[PDB]
Design a protein around this ligand. Structure first.
Ligand code: K
Ligand code: K
Lengths: 126, 126
């Protein structure tokens, strides 16, 4: 299952842009969160994307001219990330695969947490 | 503030061991969580540690024979991670500083989520 040890969620992008994470499907009516994480790197950026406890749906897109792919754990495959909410990269909690899912209807209800949600660009010195 | 873009939380360890994250200070009685993330690497492991939305306290320790330090963002400083819950590395939400805090009284109430909490070892191919 993605997000468990051995199946961590990594992103690789090229050029500047924003990776946006939508955290939804909250238990006990917890409100959804949406936050864009910008990078100014001109080359390759590597990223670690986390879930939050008590949520069951995680959807993300990349907005940037350059490419963006995801990798699970130490797997070798790298596959394209979604670039619009109509075709978001989505994980249902418990799943071992990233799917494409239209989450456009979820976005307006989410609280904005730009620059403070659970997706992180790795630095040049790690 | 730690966990915001630019101030992401990274760990570096040497040798095999377990990095354990205690997520607490939950909003309105959300249960605390504790989970150990093992590594079997004999050399250096690099890690990304995430918060979860709706929690305000994050404490972590390293249990292993080797060293363990944390780095904030692309900062150059690396400082030792706590090695017991009585002297845990702790972040209070909103702080820019990792403090030492005795969280032994919090651990017993936390739900065990070993191998399924918000700390991630980076793979050899990222
Ligand atoms: K921004
Ligand atoms: K950054």
């Amino acid at each position: 299952a993605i997000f468990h040890t051995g199946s961590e969620l990594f992103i690789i992008t090229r050029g500047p842009g924003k990776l946006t994470l939508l955290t939804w499907g909250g238990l006990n009516n917890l409100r959804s969160v949406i936050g864009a994480i910008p990078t100014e790197n001109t080359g390759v950026t590597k990223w670690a994307v986390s879930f939050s406890h008590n949520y069951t749906r995680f959807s993300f897109i990349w907005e940037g001219q350059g490419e963006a792919c995801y990798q699970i754990g130490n797997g070798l495959t790298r596959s394209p990330v979604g670039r619009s909410w109509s075709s978001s990269s989505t994980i249902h909690w418990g799943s071992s695969t990233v799917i494409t899912e239209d989450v456009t209807s979820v976005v307006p209800g989410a609280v904005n947490r730009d620059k403070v949600t659970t997706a992180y660009a790795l630095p040049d010195n790690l």
